[PDB]
Amino acid sequence: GTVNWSVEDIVKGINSNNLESQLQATQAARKLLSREKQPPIDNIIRAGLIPKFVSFLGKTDCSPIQFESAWALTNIASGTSEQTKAVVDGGAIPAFISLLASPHAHISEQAVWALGNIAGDGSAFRDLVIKHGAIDPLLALLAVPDLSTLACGYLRNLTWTLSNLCRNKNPAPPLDAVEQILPTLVRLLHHNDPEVLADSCWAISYLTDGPNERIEMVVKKGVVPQLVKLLGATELPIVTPALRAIGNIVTGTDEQTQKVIDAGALAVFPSLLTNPKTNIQKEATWTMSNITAGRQDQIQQVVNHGLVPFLVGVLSKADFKTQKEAAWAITNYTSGGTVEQIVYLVHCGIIEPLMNLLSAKDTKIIQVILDAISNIFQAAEKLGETEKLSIMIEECGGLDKIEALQRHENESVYKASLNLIEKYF
Amino acid sequence: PVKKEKIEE
Amino acid sequence: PVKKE
């Protein structure tokens, strides 16, 4: 009979001076907060229960009230920022960090989970969790010879919590905290549980989402080969974060991009660029765009891996957002490529799908495509093949669309269009 | 997923 | 060219 209690009854129990009565009421609150239909978090907060639950976290003599209060506070911290703030404002952070040392694994795990909810709110609570010294005790829980001896649920919760300490920007986590965590993350990226791997990849994705210096910290740990392996996994929950991380890395230096290429990434892109999940196709095409923005030798590896036909494919037929990323990939290829490389692109069939996209109701893509046409014409000028290109564009319905564009709202469009017609048509 | 409710155990 | 996030 700790099921379906009223808040009034929970309060009466918790305000009793009877530790057992307090425990029963705390469990009743936990069960309330563990129901799927509108858990009454705000009523619990308004009753003034958070301070009591936090004090129960410190009752080493009564392990069950520690657990029940920990779970109750976890579910409150799971809610809105305001609800998470209430838990923090009750002094929960230092009390949960103390509980990480509990001899009872179920209590340690609950404290891990609660700190994940708190750090997960945002940069400020993440950083406050770090300042109260959570990282050392968290990592100590993973200091075992073989992670496989740890309970599955426990290891997954720890990985998820660590990923939330890696998460959010403005600002990004403290550099020294990232350096402290990364060796353990590297280890978890090699664990064989799909959920640990997914959360480990998500953590790396967050740490790579920033300036080149943040990317370098990750790349210098030697994880890129393992990320490429995970890019080839069957489980979408793994591939999604692995590809985001790879995509983040290739937004860095050409030397950082090369590590991805050297690790064998481009061999997975035939699958990625034809993947049934639209998001994967989008993100893979975005990744390709930042590789085509690289050096000519890097463009050549794209060519050698047979990926230009796949880019023609996505340009020809994909969700609009993927097609725009593909347009970017082409404009980048055309901007940085050799004449021979640009010729290859036309021989693979780029012109018709590019022209077909000029009918789109998106100014940016039109700008991108018009820029790419100009770049191709520039290479044709160097080969004296301007007329052949002009004819191709005319034969596939392009000239009509470019003409219309001379009469377009956007200035860049009409200017770029007018120029092309004036110089080639 | 940012935050997680614990429903049962 | 330039990369983009």
Author numbering:
A (entry chain A): 72 to 496
B (entry chain C): 1 to 9
C (entry chain B): 1 to 5
The authors write:
Importin‐α is critical for successful nuclear import as it recognizes and binds to cargo proteins bearing a classical nuclear localization signal (NLS), which facilitates their transport from the cytoplasm into the nucleus. Importin‐α possesses an α‐solenoid tertiary structure characterized by a deep concave surface ideal for NLS‐cargo binding (Fournier et al. 2013). Notably, the twist causes the concave surface to become deeper at the N‐ and C‐termini, resulting in what is commonly known as the major (ARMs 2–4) and minor (ARMs 6–8) NLS‐binding grooves, respectively.
To validate the computational modeling design, the analogs were co‐crystallized with importin‐α, and their structures were experimentally determined by X‐ray crystallography. The crystal structures of A1–A4 in complex with mImpα2 at resolutions ranging from 2.11 to 2.42 Å were determined. The crystal structures had the same space groups as the original TAF8 NLS/importin‐α complex and every amino acid was resolved for all analogs bound at the major groove. Accordingly, the analogs bury an average surface area of 629.6 ± 21.2 Å2 in the major groove. The Cα backbone of the analogs exhibited RMSD values of 0.485, 0.529, 0.487, and 0.513 Å for A1, A2, A3, and A4, respectively, at the major groove. Visual inspection revealed that although the side chains for K299, K300, and K301 residues aligned at the P2, P3, and P4 sites, indicating that the analogs also relied on the consensus sequences for their binding, there were notable spatial orientational differences for some other residues and the amino acid contributions for A1–A4 changed significantly from the computational modeling. Crystal structures of these analogs complexed with mImpα2 confirmed their binding modes, albeit the novel interactions formed in the modeling procedure were disrupted by DTT used during crystallization.
